[PDB]
Subunit: 103 residues, 4 copies
């Protein structure tokens, strides 16, 4: 009986440990399955957002050129205006002087 008790003691311990490990393993498998599903989703969200970023960044260079050329055209015209208003003022001074000389 003492022999049987020694054996049963070791058996009982091993069965206890085994039951705890099976429980722990089942819980870990559930958590792993969940993390994997969420990882698949967020990877898809990343791919989508990368594609949108990429298209936007591609359009940028052409739009920057459009803006530069439009701004350059505006400036050219503002300068022509300044030139014409300068020309007018000069004409009036020159004209006023010429009419004084004919008196």
């Amino acid at each position: 009986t003492k022999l049987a008790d020694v054996y049963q003691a070791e058996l009982r311990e091993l069965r206890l440990r085994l039951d705890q490990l099976t429980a722990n393993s089942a819980r870990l498998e559930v958590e792993r399955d969940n993390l994997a599903q969420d990882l698949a989703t967020v990877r898809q969200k990343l791919q989508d957002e990368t594609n949108l970023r990429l298209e936007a960044e591609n359009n940028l260079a052409a739009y920057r050129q459009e803006a530069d050329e439009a701004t350059l055209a505006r400036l050219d015209l503002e300068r022509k205006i300044e030139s014409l208003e300068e020309e007018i003022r000069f004409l009036r001074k020159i004209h006023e002087e010429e009419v004084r000389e004919l008196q």
Copy 2:
């Protein structure tokens, strides 16, 4: 003797299973740790790629708006130019006339 033999057999089996289950559990914990790490990583990449997308889209919007402002300003200026050129023509005509009369 038959009894000890049944016990030693079960003892050997349980130790075999236990070693496999411990290995399996260790592996699962490693897999779970990895999935969690990668999930944190890709979530960060998603956030980054969203921020870059938004900034790109904003720069696109800004370049379109600037061009529009430049084009509208240009058109307004072209009309002021036509006005100034008319004014110049009228000034020369009036002055050429005044010059003829004073002679």
Copy 3:
């Protein structure tokens, strides 16, 4: 005459502006040439550093697996050690019992 002065004044202003603009344009040409050379340099450095970053990031997953497998192997052995020490303890208990039963 005053008329000649009016004309010479406008001429003087235009010439000075032209001189100022030519000087500024020469400066700007130099600065543009420099910015372009440096831009080419830093673009090359960027490409190089991107290639290294990319290869490092690619090797990451493989090195993490190497570490995981090495750690898993270690654990398997530490467990086999515990198994053998348990077996020893049990053998001594069983042996002591058998020795008592056989006087």
Copy 4:
């Protein structure tokens, strides 16, 4: 009198104005190109700094994983010897016990 002079002066004025219009246009264009090159230079310098930081973190994690593998392997080797020692001990215990009966 002034007619001769006015003609010469108006001609030079016309030339200078034409030149100013061309040079002002060119300068404006150069200013735009310089502003752009500077902007892009700032951009790519930032990308370089970012890419360097990512490279360094990656290389650090590589280094750390290589250290983990080396230490784990060394521990494994030490354990395999302890295993041999324990198996030797077991065999000695069984032979000594079998003798004692």
